[PDB]
Amino acid sequence: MSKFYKIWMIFDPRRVFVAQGVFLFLLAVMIHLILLSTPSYNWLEISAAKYNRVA
Amino acid sequence: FYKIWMIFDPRRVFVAQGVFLFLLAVMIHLILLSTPSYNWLEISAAKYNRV
Amino acid sequence: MSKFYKIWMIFDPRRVFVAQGVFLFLLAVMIHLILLSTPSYNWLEISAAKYNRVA
Amino acid sequence: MSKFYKIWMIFDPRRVFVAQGVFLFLLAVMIHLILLSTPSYNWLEISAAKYNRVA
Amino acid sequence: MSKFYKIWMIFDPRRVFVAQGVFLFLLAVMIHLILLSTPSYNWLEISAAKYNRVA
Amino acid sequence: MSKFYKIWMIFDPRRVFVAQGVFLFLLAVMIHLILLSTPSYNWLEISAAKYNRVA
Amino acid sequence: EVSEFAFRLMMAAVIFVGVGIMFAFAGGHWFVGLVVGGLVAAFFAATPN
Amino acid sequence: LGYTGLTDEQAQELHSVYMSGLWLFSAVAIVAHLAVYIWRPWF
Amino acid sequence: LTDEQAQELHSVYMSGLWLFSAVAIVAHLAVYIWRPWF
Amino acid sequence: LGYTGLTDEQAQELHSVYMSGLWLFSAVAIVAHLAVYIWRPWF
Amino acid sequence: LGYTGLTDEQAQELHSVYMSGLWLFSAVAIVAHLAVYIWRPWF
Amino acid sequence: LGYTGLTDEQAQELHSVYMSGLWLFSAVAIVAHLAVYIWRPWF
Amino acid sequence: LGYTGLTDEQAQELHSVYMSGLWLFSAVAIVAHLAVYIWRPWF
Amino acid sequence: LGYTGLTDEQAQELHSVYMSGLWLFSAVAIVAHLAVYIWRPWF
Amino acid sequence: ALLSFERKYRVPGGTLVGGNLFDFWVGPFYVGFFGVATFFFAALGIILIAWSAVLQGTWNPQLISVYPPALEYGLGGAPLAKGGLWQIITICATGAFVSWALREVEICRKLGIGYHIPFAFAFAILAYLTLVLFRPVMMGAWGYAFPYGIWTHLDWVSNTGYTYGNFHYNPAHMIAISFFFTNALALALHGALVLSAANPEKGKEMRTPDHEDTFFRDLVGYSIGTLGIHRLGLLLSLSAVFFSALCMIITGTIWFDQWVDWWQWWVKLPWWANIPGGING
Amino acid sequence: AEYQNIFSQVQVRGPADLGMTEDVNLANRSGVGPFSTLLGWFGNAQLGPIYLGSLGVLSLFSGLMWFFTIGIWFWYQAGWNPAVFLRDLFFFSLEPPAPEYGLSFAAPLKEGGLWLIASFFMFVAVWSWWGRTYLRAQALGMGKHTAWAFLSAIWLWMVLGFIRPILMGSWSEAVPYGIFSHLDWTNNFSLVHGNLFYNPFHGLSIAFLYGSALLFAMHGATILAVSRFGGERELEQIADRGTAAERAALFWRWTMGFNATMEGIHRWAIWMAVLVTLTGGIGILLSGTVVDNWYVWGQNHGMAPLN
Ligand SMILES: CCCCCCCCCCCCCC(=O)OC[C@H](COP(=O)(O)OCC(O)COP(=O)(O)OC[C@@H](COC(=O)CCCCCCCCCCCCC)OC(=O)CCCCCCCCCCCCC)OC(=O)CCCCCCCCCCCCC
Ligand code: BCL
Ligand code: BCL
Ligand SMILES: CC[C@H]1c2cc3[nH]c4c(c3C)C(=O)[C@H](C(=O)OC)c4c3nc(cc4[nH]c(cc(n2)[C@@H]1C)c(C(C)=O)c4C)[C@@H](C)[C@@H]3CCC(=O)OC/C=C(\C)CCC[C@H](C)CCC[C@H](C)CCCC(C)C
Ligand SMILES: CC[C@H]1c2cc3[nH]c4c(c3C)C(=O)[C@H](C(=O)OC)c4c3nc(cc4[nH]c(cc(n2)[C@@H]1C)c(C(C)=O)c4C)[C@@H](C)[C@@H]3CCC(=O)OC/C=C(\C)CCC[C@H](C)CCC[C@H](C)CCCC(C)C
Ligand SMILES: COC(C)(C)C/C=C/C(C)=C/C=C/C(C)=C/C=C/C(C)=C/C=C/C=C(C)/C=C/C=C(\C)CC/C=C(\C)CCC=C(C)C
Ligand SMILES: COC(C)(C)C/C=C/C(C)=C/C=C/C(C)=C/C=C/C(C)=C/C=C/C=C(C)/C=C/C=C(\C)CC/C=C(\C)CCC=C(C)C
Ligand SMILES: COC(C)(C)C/C=C/C(C)=C/C=C/C(C)=C/C=C/C(C)=C/C=C/C=C(C)/C=C/C=C(\C)CC/C=C(\C)CCC=C(C)C
Ligand SMILES: COC(C)(C)C/C=C/C(C)=C/C=C/C(C)=C/C=C/C(C)=C/C=C/C=C(C)/C=C/C=C(\C)CC/C=C(\C)CCC=C(C)C
Ligand SMILES: COC(C)(C)C/C=C/C(C)=C/C=C/C(C)=C/C=C/C(C)=C/C=C/C=C(C)/C=C/C=C(\C)CC/C=C(\C)CCC=C(C)C
Ligand SMILES: COC(C)(C)C/C=C/C(C)=C/C=C/C(C)=C/C=C/C(C)=C/C=C\C=C(C)\C=C\C=C(/C)CC/C=C(\C)CCC=C(C)C
Ligand SMILES: CCCCCCCCCCCCO[C@@H]1O[C@H](CO)[C@@H](O[C@H]2O[C@H](CO)[C@@H](O)[C@H](O)[C@H]2O)[C@H](O)[C@H]1O
Ligand SMILES: [Fe+3]
């Protein structure tokens, strides 16, 4: 269990960290886009309805 | 099992596993989201009368 | 927290700052376009209605 | 804050100045074009309506 | 302000002056073309209507 | 004003007179073509109408 | 034997289709999948060890 | 030993700092999830 | 890599798979408690 | 040692002012969100 | 010292002039925005 | 000093003549805008 | 001094000839514009 | 002295011959324009 | 009869099939097992075209036209006078083209050169088989192939194209055209540059490859180099043919409508589909 | 497989090459550009220098004004809207004067006066670039083969934009500047002239176009196949024939009964490509001036069956 750190002797941290950044940003963007494409969770439209902003 | 780390470079195996497992996991969630009986966001919206 | 500075032992700051500047601008432009694409948050159209500037 | 001047120890000021000048003009043009294409803010058409310059 | 003259120690004046000459001509051309494309500001059509030169 | 003569110490006069002659020719043709495209200023069509040559 | 760049091209192709499908769903248009999946797979293909 | 040059000591050091980054990142996420759940429960 | 390194790395790897699969088993139980598929 | 050739103290120097850039940038953003939220709340 | 070869003094000198141009450009833009807002408010 | 190889006096000499051109061009432009505005206001 | 290697005396002479051409060309153009405006005013 | 290796003496002579060609060509052009204007005025 | 340097190269071996049985020359032409095959298929196809002209009732070589079977035959064999001759000639053509490529391989082997030439020719064969074999069997009839006749195969091109409106709007066809035009440009420049170096101004020494680099750098700011231009000319040609085959194998198989309508996907992207003005608003 | 020499295995880089001097005015060369390691996999990595003398200034500034004139017309057609500009980009078109204006210059700016202005900038740009190709060869003491080859492309371009419109008597015959519109013009031209496939010079032009792809496929593949012998050092093979040139010649001799030389294959190359646009320009120039219905012409010249 304790030895998980040895992965950094087999991968270069530059490559891993860039891949992590790309991975996490894409995942976050994908999730926010799905919520925006879900009418029950599109916060801009929820607010528009709540405050009677259209007509 | 453990002899796979002789058959291959471990970097390739971990790259291939990590990519495939993520694409697998994502598509299973996309299948559930495209299934009306299991889309949690839609089920929640019906429960809480949001739509 | 304290040891996060060691990232500059890994990443050359020049390359990071270019990538970061590009990322932040595109992220900002993306969000402003989303709001302009939204009738409840397109400030130019909200303005036109508020002051009755069209017709 | 006031250590910000060290950015010039990392970035060649020629490449920064060229990049910035291109960025600032293209951004300014982009915004003026958005406003020319927006009927509530096209200043040429607004003045044409104000001064009855057509019909 | 007064130290701005050091820009000629960073940028070669020959390259700047060519770049600026092209920039200012294309900008000036664009604005004159925009106004010619604008019925309220096309000076040739304005004078034609004013002096009854056409139709 | 009086010191503008030092332009010739940084720009090769051969290049400047070429670039200037090119510029002036292209600008002059462009303006004459604009006037020819302009019915109120096409001097050949004006003189045709003036002298009843358009037939 | 498969060289690192040949492996990189294979994984980039897998990444292209997988990222393409998920962003096509998330973006609500297949072109969003093509743009995102393409640029990510190109980044992957360009970067062998 | 392994291909990418960091020593065992450096691997331990980097992993300890790395994990502290993950915990900070995931802590901020947990608060954001709690805020959204309190506002609009997804179950 | 040596045979020892292969045995070492595999013993590390399997402990990661045990953790991941345990979290997955809990997640399937959580979905089952919420809403079974059978 | 470092892939950049920075020493430890050089990395501390550069990070300490880098973070001040982020804190400045985010502080301006927080005011921007505050003004916009006061103008048109999204919750 | 630096990757560019600029000394600390050269960087301090350059930044002082650059920052004065930045604030000059910002001041003109602020007057430009203020005039446009009085002419035709967007908010 | 300098990437261009100009001395400080040369750069200061050159800038004085450049600025005189910029102000002259600006003055002509200001008069042109004033004439066009008095002829046909755009606000 | 400068990039072309012209002497200051050469540059003064060359400019005096050039400006004699510029004033000659512009004088003809001014006469042309006056004749066209008298013929057919564009304002 | 200049770029071409013509002497000032050669440059003065060549210009005198060239200008006599220019005046000859332009004189013929002037006569041609007068004839056409007499025949068919374009103003 | 040999070229003055040829004899040292005319050694045994390198054959794929037949050993020494066909390892000989007929004048300049190397034979081999596939030379026998190529000649037989070529002669048979040529004579069957001439016989098809007898059946057609014309001797004008511009009017000779061997049509494929009517669509009613599907992928079955037709009567020889009613498209079965096209079937046999297509088999002969395919036999000749493949035999010719395989003969080039054993010529490469005897000369010790790379296989780039027969590999490059296989792209032309696969484009041909796209139009006569793969696309017709996907579409389910031989009658979708083109007829063997000098002007009548252009009628097939015209009729096939206008089935989908203006065929310029096929996106793969646009790409293929761009490679074809770019290849002809590169060929002209490459021919001219080598000749301009080998044949300088009168009485000058031959220019070096350094002058070739210099001319193109001076002209366009870049030179691809002597190796790069031959790589380029090959890949431009092959890409043109690859995208040609692609543009046809999708046409009538996955795409059926007027190709101009395909481009509406871009115009009707949701973030700008409804913005007024322009051409499409 | 063995190594195919399509992409380099190892790149090397040295001091930048400033080029040969000859009679070139070295003051008009730029400095060297960056080295692209991406391009260095396929060709040379070095970018630049570039030569920028008097005709280059004329050509680039005229070409810029051509491109800018079309661009500002597209921004006007877009209603100045950046989203519409990118949406409709391939659909915008700067169109020649309508037929009723003939060859006159009286057409309004929106009605083809801007097309004339842009076409003037194009004319100057292309012809001054031709003189640039000629003079760059002259200053290096090279043969003028490149300029004369380029004149064949200019011949088709001149026919399309200038000569055929004048012979037909209106500018409306010329090509519109626009991505889809020039394709639509290409289709319309064939339909008006009764199927351009039956224009024999269009048929020849296609033969040479296909022949150019054939010949460059052959030549490129041949040189790569002998590159293991230094075959791509073609000028040295011309000056001193090695086994590379001999094996190349014999491959084609044994294949098809005849061959080229290392010089003379480039004579086939230049002429094959030149003939595309040489025959092309003749075929277009004949269309509408001499033959208005090429299919009917083909029926009367024994190449299409009679009705
Ligand atoms: C202007 C726009 C128009 C379209 C115009 C399109 C033109 C396209 C031309 C392309 C030429 C490429 C080949 C080439 O080598 O180019 C470089 C070459 C040499 O360069 P250099 O620097 O001057 O010299 C270097 C020196 O070391 C010698 O080099 P090299 O040995 O390689 O040069 C000899 C070449 C060059 O010869 C030519 O280029 C002749 C070009 C003829 C073009 C005719 C096409 C149109 C007519 C056909 C239309 C047909 C359909 C209508 O030698 C050869 O290539 C010889 C070719 C022999 C062909 C023999 C054909 C005989 C047929 C008659 C048989 C009768 C039997 C009874 O340049 C030249 O020699 C000058 C080329 C001049 C081109 C024509 C210019 C326009 C002519 C018409 C207007 C002016 C006259 C009225
Ligand atoms: C590629 C996409 C289309 C097509 C579209 C067009 C169009 C469009 C045009 C032609 C043209 C030609 N086509 Mg076709 N053509 C196709 C398929 C073929 C095939 C084939 C086996 O696939 C062949 C041999 C031909 C042959 C030919 C020639 C008659 C002519 C000149 C080609 C050329 O120079 O090419 C490059 C090759 C060389 C320069 C080398 C020399 C080639 C010689 C000239 C070929 C002679 C073929 C001979 C008459 C056919 C009978 C063979 C004998 C029985 C042995 N076409 C398919 C269906 N083709 C043009 C023409 O003028 O048609 C009348 C024309 O306008
Ligand atoms: C429905 C459409 C019609 C048709 C209508 C036409 C028309 C109309 C024309 C052709 C022409 C051509 N046709 Mg046809 N054609 C059809 C069917 C075909 C088919 C086929 C398989 O069906 C094929 C292969 C062809 C093939 C061809 C080519 C052989 C020929 C163009 C050569 C060339 O390179 O032009 C492209 C090259 C040029 C135009 C030269 C350009 C040179 C200038 C100087 C470049 C300037 C560049 C500029 C300054 C910008 C530079 C910017 C850079 C960034 C630096 N046609 C059908 C029947 N075809 C042309 C021809 O010659 O006909 C005889 C022609 O005009
Ligand atoms: C892939 C890129 C380009 C390419 C490449 C290419 N072609 C090649 C090669 C290469 C690399 C060769 O090595 C090979 C060769 O040896 O060249 C001299 C060949 C070749 N390319 C040829 C022609 C050719 N290539 C063409 C195209 C192209 N070739 C591509 C654009 C075209 C057309 C129309 O675009 C033609 C006409 C030959 C000169 C030659 C192949 C010779 C060969 O196959 O010889 C054996 C067969 C015969 C001698 C005759 C067979 C006769 C048939 C049995 C009957 C006729 C049937 C035919 C279908 C009739 C069609 C009638 C037409 C009116 C439609
Ligand atoms: C023999 C026939 C073939 C042929 C040959 C051929 N073409 C040639 C040559 C030859 C032998 C040359 O020598 C010449 C050349 O230089 O090649 C490298 C050329 C050439 N063939 C060209 C193109 C071309 N050739 C084509 C085709 C063909 N070329 C035929 C297949 C085609 C098509 C449609 O098939 C095209 C498009 C050019 C690359 C070049 C001629 C260049 C020329 O005349 O340019 C004039 C215009 C300019 C110099 C500039 C235009 C404006 C640009 C946007 C630049 C702007 C610069 C500015 C500083 C930036 C502005 C930015 C702002 C707007 C934001
Ligand atoms: C719509 O629903 C969907 C479809 C999305 C459902 C599917 C969801 C899926 C499949 C989700 C998958 C989620 C996953 C796999 C998430 C993984 C997250 C991880 C692993 C996050 C890790 C974050 C780590 C961070 C932020 C670490 C940062 C570290 C640092 C800042 C320090 C780095 C170390 C340094 C500087 C030390 C250097 C050392 C030396 C010696 C110089
Ligand atoms: C889609 O979204 C829309 C477009 C609708 C809205 C969103 C828009 C967005 C996201 C906009 C973002 C804008 C940003 C990020 C703007 C940033 C602007 C900045 C940072 C501007 C900086 C300007 C600086 C200037 C003008 C500096 C000038 C300096 C000088 C002239 C002097 C230079 C120094 C010299 C000469 C000293 C040399 C010294 C020595 C010793 C040689
Ligand atoms: C998908 O749908 C939407 C977009 C609506 C929702 C999703 C949004 C998402 C996923 C957003 C994600 C946002 C993120 C991850 C933002 C992160 C932003 C960061 C990290 C910003 C950091 C900014 C840092 C700045 C401005 C730092 C500036 C530094 C300086 C000015 C100092 C320069 C000098 C130095 C470093 C000293 C050099 C030292 C020496 C010795 C030479
Ligand atoms: C509605 O339309 C649009 C969308 C286009 C609206 C938007 C418009 C925008 C974004 C406009 C932006 C405009 C800007 C950024 C303009 C900037 C103009 C500048 C920087 C002008 C500078 C002018 C300088 C001049 C004229 C200098 C002239 C110099 C001379 C005449 C003398 C020549 C130089 C000499 C002698 C120096 C050499 C001396 C020695 C001793 C070596
Ligand atoms: C866009 O829509 C339109 C076009 C309608 C409106 C817009 C128009 C625009 C943007 C117009 C812009 C116009 C401008 C900026 C024009 C500038 C013109 C200039 C700078 C003209 C100068 C001309 C100078 C001349 C003709 C000088 C000639 C010199 C000589 C004849 C002397 C030659 C001999 C010399 C120098 C020898 C001396 C030698 C020794 C050795 C001492
Ligand atoms: C981003 O926005 C900006 C504005 C900055 C830049 C954008 C630029 C854009 C979007 C440019 C678009 C360019 C396009 C789409 C160009 C398309 C060109 C095409 C496809 C041309 C095709 C054929 C053209 C031909 C055959 C033209 C031949 C012309 C001639 C032979 C010229 C003959 C000369 C004439 C007619 C002039 C006669 C008049 C006088 C006064 C002598
Ligand atoms: C690369 C070469 C490409 C060209 C290759 C051509 C190969 C042709 C092989 C044909 C093989 C035999 O194909 C056979 O044809 C006959 C006759 O049409 C078809 O027969 C079909 O039509 C006949 C009448 O015309 C009906 O009576 C029959 O019931 C029907 O099936 C068979 O269904 C098919 O099996
Ligand atoms: Fe070659």
Tell me whether residue P307 is in a domain. Answer: no
Token pair, residue O228, equals 């790069």
Would you give the DSSP letter of residue P177? B
In this structure, the strands spanning O29-30 and O25-26 are antiparallel
Are P182 and P75 in the same domain? no
Are P148 and P24 in the same domain? no
Q: Tell me which residue of C35, O5, F42 sits closest to P259, measured CA to CA.
A: O5
Domain boundary among P143, P172, P192: P143
Tell me the domains of chain O and their CATH numbers.
Answer: 1-163 (1.20.85.10), 164-263 (1.20.85.10)
Q: Quote the longest CA-to-CA distance of chain A.
A: 62
Domain boundary among P143, P169, P184: P143
8 Å CB contact between F7 and M10: no
Establish if N39 touches chain F: CB-CB under 8 angstroms: no
Ligand 9 atom at shortest distance from the alpha carbon of D32: 4
Interface test with C, best of A18, A20, A44 (most C CBs within 10 A): A44
According to DSSP, the residues that pair with J10 across neighbouring strands are none
8 Å CB contact between B48 and H41: yes
Are P82 and P193 in the same domain? no
Task: Mark yes or no for CB contact G49/B19 under 8 Å.
Answer: no
Q: Tell me which residue of P157, P101, P163 sits closest to P130, measured CA to CA.
A: P157
Domain count across chain P: 2
Interface test with K, best of E1, E2, E3, E5 (most K CBs within 10 A): E3
Q: Which residues line ligand 7 (CB under 6 A)?
A: C 28-29, 32-33; D 27, 30-31; E 4, 6-7, 9-10; K 10, 13-14, 17-18, 21-22, 25
Are P246 and P294 in the same domain? yes
Ligand 2 centre from E37 Cα, in Å? 50
Are P287 and P170 in the same domain? yes
Are P137 and P170 in the same domain? no
Q: At what angle do helices P114-139 and P145-158 cross, to 10 degrees?
A: 170
Using DSSP's 3-state secondary structure scheme, residue P104 falls into coil
Q: Is the CB of F54 under 6 A from ligand 9?
A: no
Tell me whether residue P22 is in a domain. Answer: yes
Using DSSP's 3-state secondary structure scheme, residue O179 falls into helix
Tell me whether residue P27 is in a domain. Answer: yes
- Where do the H-state alpha helices sit in I1-38? 3-34
Are P136 and P200 in the same domain? no
Establish if P50 touches chain E: CB-CB under 8 angstroms: no
Which of D10, D13, D46 has the CB atom closest to K14's CB atom? D13
Q: What is the rounded CA–CA span in Å between residue L4 and residue M2?
A: 11
Task: Mark yes or no for CB contact L40/E7 under 8 Å.
Answer: no
Are P197 and P256 in the same domain? yes
Please name the method used to determine this structure: cryo-EM
- Where do the H-state alpha helices sit in F1-55? 13-37, 43-50
Are P269 and P137 in the same domain? no
Q: What is the rounded CA–CA span in Å between residue E24 and residue E17?
A: 10
Are P281 and P174 in the same domain? yes
Task: Mark yes or no for CB contact L15/E7 under 8 Å.
Answer: yes
* P69-80 burial: b if 16+ Cβ within 10 Å, else e: bbbbbbbbbbbb
Task: Please check if D40 is assigned to a binding site.
Answer: no
Residue O29: exposed, middle, or buried by beta-carbon count in 10 A (0-12, 13-18, 19+)? middle
Q: Which amino acid is at D36?
A: L
Q: Which residues line ligand 5 (CB under 6 A)?
A: O 181, 184-185, 188-189, 192, 219-220; P 59-60, 63-64, 67-68, 125-126, 129, 133, 146, 149-150, 152-153, 273-274, 276-277
Provide, as residue numbers in chain A, all residues whose Cβ is less than 8 Å from the Cβ of J41.
47, 51
Establish if C11 touches chain A: CB-CB under 8 angstroms: yes
User: H/E element holding O26?
Assistant: strand O25-26
Provide, as residue numbers in chain E, all residues whose Cβ is less than 8 Å from the Cβ of K24.
1
Q: Quote the longest CA-to-CA distance of chain L.
A: 51
Q: What is the CATH number of the domain that holds P229?
A: 1.20.85.10
Q: What is the rounded CA–CA span in Å between residue P184 and residue P195?
A: 15
Chains that touch D (3 or more CB pairs under 8 A): C, E, J, K, L, P
Q: Give the number of whichever ligand sits closest to the CA of residue M2.
A: 9
According to DSSP, the residues that pair with P29 across neighbouring strands are P51
Using DSSP's 3-state secondary structure scheme, residue P46 falls into strand
Which segments of M are annotated as binding site for a bacteriochlorophyll? 15, 33
In chain H, what is the straight-line distance between the N-terminal and C-terminal CA atoms, in Å?
49
Would you give the DSSP letter of residue P159? I
According to DSSP, the residues that pair with P62 across neighbouring strands are none
Token pair, residue O131, equals 């139009």
Are P45 and P178 in the same domain? no
Task: Mark yes or no for CB contact F9/M14 under 8 Å.
Answer: no
Q: What is the rounded CA–CA span in Å between residue J14 and residue D5?
A: 11
Ligand 4 atom at shortest distance from the alpha carbon of O128: 59
* Distance (Å) from the alpha carbon of C3 to chain H's nearest alpha carbon: 7
Ligand 4 centre from P274 Cα, in Å? 21
Are P295 and P157 in the same domain? yes
Establish if J39 touches chain C: CB-CB under 8 angstroms: no
Q: What is the rounded CA–CA span in Å between residue P92 and residue M35?
A: 40
| Residue P176, Ramachandran bin (φ over 0: left; ψ between -120 and 50: alpha; else beta) | beta
Token pair, residue P128, equals 């001054």
8 Å CB contact between P295 and P198: yes
Q: Tell me which residue of P267, P29, P16, P266 sits closest to P139, measured CA to CA.
A: P29
Show the domain range for P189.
Answer: 144-301
Q: What is the rounded CA–CA span in Å between residue O40 and residue O35?
A: 8
Token pair, residue H41, equals 């429960």
Q: What is the rounded CA–CA span in Å between residue P292 and residue K32?
A: 62
HSE-up (13 A, CA, CB side) for residue O97: 17
**Distance, CA of O106 to chain centre:** 22
Residue O277: exposed, middle, or buried by beta-carbon count in 10 A (0-12, 13-18, 19+)? middle
- Where do the H-state alpha helices sit in chain C? 7-10, 13-36, 43-50
O143 to A34, O156, O161, O250: CA distances (angstroms):
49, 10, 15, 17
**Distance, CA of O278 to chain centre:** 41
Residues with CB under 5 A from ligand 13 (ion): P 234
Q: What is the rounded CA–CA span in Å between residue O239 and residue O249?
A: 15
Establish if B11 touches chain A: CB-CB under 8 angstroms: yes
Would you give the DSSP letter of residue C5? G
Task: Mark yes or no for CB contact L16/F4 under 8 Å.
Answer: no
Domain boundary among P111, P143, P175: P143
According to DSSP, the residues that pair with O222 across neighbouring strands are P47
